[PDB]
Write a protein that binds this ligand. Structure first.
Ligand SMILES: [Zn+2]
Lengths: 70, 286, 50, 287
């Protein structure tokens, strides 16, 4: 089941991602990102990304439906 | 000219239930139905099918019933709800196939010119056999031989598109033969990959037992086509010798000093990190 | 709070959480976050202006 | 004499007809029927599903064609098995699952004709990864407004299978229709033939992928594993009392000391053993 978990975490990102830009970080594993569709959002972020690449600004990859940082 | 057929997993699946539909009155031990298809290239595609009433008699084995009118209307239905799909052939089961299949095929080649048939194996489902598909050509037989039909074979496979793997992966949920394998997974692939090696070989064992012993008339084509196999296996030599230990050692070096040492030192790091954190909580309890 | 953003549940529009960090778009080079580039002593000859 | 926590059995052959036909017409909200048998009071099974030709109206009562109805039923009587219709389904691409205002009228038509006539909503474009957004529902009366809607009783399997999701209770849940549980009539000889025939490789089990790319890959890992070993040197000879339980937690990065370590040692081990062990067997087996 540990290998099932790492697979399903892995295959959430190989997808037609949408691209927004990182805006602000609330805390651990949750932040504010604004999309390039307009309409600024507030979603959860992963545990994969090292958090030192989100300074105030970075173009980021976002899921369509769940809309989280990818 | 068919490269290979692609079996969508709804069709076989929709054969097994229809065998189970008639199974409450089951005395036929064969199920014949219509195989819809989508011809694209030299590779063939199948994604839908249905069944048709069919009977067959053990005596004289040449009185048989495909229903044309049932084949007309229900295909007219599936055309109306989906104009992408058309017929490509037919199916049956019971791997010891009845010899009537010349007559079944030569009838419904007036629906598809390059008609094709697929044998599924509902009850034998164990060792190495997903399905089997034939192709129909007719030479005389050979140069100085009488006439014949001679079904020929085209290789087969089981295909996969999106929104059926979604139906597949949600239905396995038990062991699944999990993604890219471990040590135990690869060794089992070598085990039952080799358990079918002699299984194909025990079949070719029995053929040249019962043809060379003296029962059934010999083919000539299969004999010399078997002959070149035995004059193609490699042997051991000095050039095989010095080369094998040249690159077995080279595979070995990566295992020996780079994997065994470094895994030990990491576990040796977990010694000191444990023993420091053990006794420093021990001596500082009181 | 003034300029207070809130987390809003996207279905039923209920207040999920008070969001901190009131709006600061494009404040990147503002508050530099790394100072050490030159020291106080390596200027020389400009003492009255210092 | 009232509803319970029921159960819906769908066959394996049904589910593949559902989300293939939904994936076929992905923009245009496809429509089909649901053909099974009301087996008792509070379980129901469905064995078979056939589709419907699509009209310009869409999912409504008018897309149900009565002459396509009785003709399709007739040619399933003599081949396969005849049985009663037990419901219907349609596809909602842009959102998960809830009965719309036109969906609720065609449910009234079937529940007046049939016993309960369970509807099914399938989202094909959301059902992608390893889970399926399929749900089944049933229209509740307004006569029980002074009584308990969802009239459930003596069982403890109501709190399972879903809590009522927020995107679905914003619509007519739970005062126009109720949810109902789904599990699968899953059996052997269909489980094993779908396992063993979709993922199998017989002669591939002793191939070689031989050595020009295998021994090349033996260079491809060792090189950065050298540099990552030098990074493993760095943290271990550091070893300072910087409150070392805090020093380990403020630099989690899915990084050097054990995470980016022996993971590579595993891949170097599994690739080379399975290569060399299959090499020795082919010398054994073939002369
Ligand atoms: Zn609808």
């Amino acid at each position: 089941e540990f290998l099932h978990a790492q697979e399903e975490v892995k295959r959430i990102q190989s997808i037609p991602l949408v691209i927004g830009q990182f805006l602000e970080a609330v805390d651990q594993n949750t932040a504010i990102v604004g999309s390039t569709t307009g309409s600024n959002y507030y979603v959860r972020i992963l545990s994969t990304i090292d958090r030192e690449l989100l300074k105030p600004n970075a173009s980021v990859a976002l899921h369509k439906h769940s809309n989280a940082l990818v | 000219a068919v490269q290979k057929v692609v079996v969508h997993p709804l069709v076989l699946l929709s054969v097994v239930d229809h065998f189970n539909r008639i199974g409450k009155v089951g005395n036929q031990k064969r199920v014949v139905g219509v195989l819809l298809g989508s011809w694209q290239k030299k590779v063939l595609d199948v994604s839908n099918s249905f069944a048709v009433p069919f009977d067959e008699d053990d005596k004289d084995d040449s009185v048989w019933f495909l229903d044309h009118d049932y084949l007309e209307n229900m295909y007219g239905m599936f055309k109306k709800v989906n104009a992408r799909e058309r017929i490509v052939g037919w199916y049956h089961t019971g791997p010891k196939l009845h010899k009537n299949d010349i007559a079944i095929n030569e009838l419904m080649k007036r629906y598809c010119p390059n008609s094709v048939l697929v044998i599924i194996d509902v009850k034998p489902k164990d060792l190495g056999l997903p399905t089997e598909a034939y192709i129909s050509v007719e030479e005389v037989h050979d140069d100085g031989t009488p006439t014949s039909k001679t079904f020929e074979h085209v290789t087969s496979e089981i295909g996969a598109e999106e929104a059926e793997e979604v139906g597949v992966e949600h239905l396995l949920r038990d062991i699944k033969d999990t993604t890219v394998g471990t040590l135990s997974q690869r060794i089992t692939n070598q085990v039952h990959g080799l358990k079918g090696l002699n299984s194909k070989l025990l079949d070719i064992r029995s053929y040249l037992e019962k043809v060379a012993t003296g029962k059934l008339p010999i083919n000539h084509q299969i004999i010399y086509q078997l002959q070149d196999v035995f004059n193609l296996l490699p042997d051991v030599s000095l050039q095989e010798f010095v080369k094998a230990f040249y690159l077995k050692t080279n595979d070995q070096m990566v295992v020996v000093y780079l994997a065994s040492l470094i895994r030990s030192v990491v576990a040796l790091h977990n010694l000191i990190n444990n023993k420091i954190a053990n006794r420093d909580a021990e001596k500082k309890e009181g | 709070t003034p300029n207070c953003r809130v987390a809003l549940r996207n279905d039923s529009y209920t207040l999920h959480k008070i969001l901190p960090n009131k709006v600061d778009p494009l404040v990147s080079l503002m508050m530099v976050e790394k100072v050490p580039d030159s020291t106080y002593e390596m200027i020389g000859g400009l003492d009255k202006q210092i | 004499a009232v509803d319970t926590a029921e159960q819906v059995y769908i066959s394996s052959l049904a589910l593949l007809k559902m989300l293939k036909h939904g994936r076929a017409g992905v923009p245009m909200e496809v429509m089909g029927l649901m053909l099974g048998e009301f087996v008792d009071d509070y379980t129901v099974r469905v064995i078979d599903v056939f589709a419907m030709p699509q009209s310009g109206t869409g999912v409504s009562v008018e897309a149900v064609d009565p002459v396509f109805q009785a003709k399709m039923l007739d040619m399933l009587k003599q081949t396969g098995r005849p049985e009663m219709v037990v419901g219907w389904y349609h596809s909602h691409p842009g959102f998960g699952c809830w009965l719309s205002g036109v969906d609720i009228n065609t449910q009234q038509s079937f529940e007046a004709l049939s016993e309960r006539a369970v509807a099914v909503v399938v989202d094909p474009i959301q059902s992608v990864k390893g889970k399926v957004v399929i749900d089944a529902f049933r229209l509740i009366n307004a006569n029980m407004m002074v009584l308990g809607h969802e009239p459930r009783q003596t069982t403890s399997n109501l709190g399972h299978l879903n809590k009522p999701s927020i995107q679905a209770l914003i619509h007519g849940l739970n005062r126009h229709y109720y949810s109902i549980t789904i599990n699968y009539r899953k059996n052997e000889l269909e489980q094993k033939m779908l396992l063993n025939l979709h993922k199998k490789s017989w002669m591939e089990g002793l191939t070689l992928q031989d050595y020009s790319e295998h021994c090349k890959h033996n260079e491809s890992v060792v090189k950065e594993m050298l540099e990552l070993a030098k990074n493993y040197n760095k943290a271990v000879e550091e070893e300072d009392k910087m409150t070392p339980e805090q020093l380990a937690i403020k630099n989690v990065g899915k990084q050097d000391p054990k995470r980016h370590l022996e993971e590579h040692v595993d891949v170097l081990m599994t690739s080379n053993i399975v290569q060399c062990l299959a090499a020795m067997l082919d010398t054994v087996v073939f002369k």
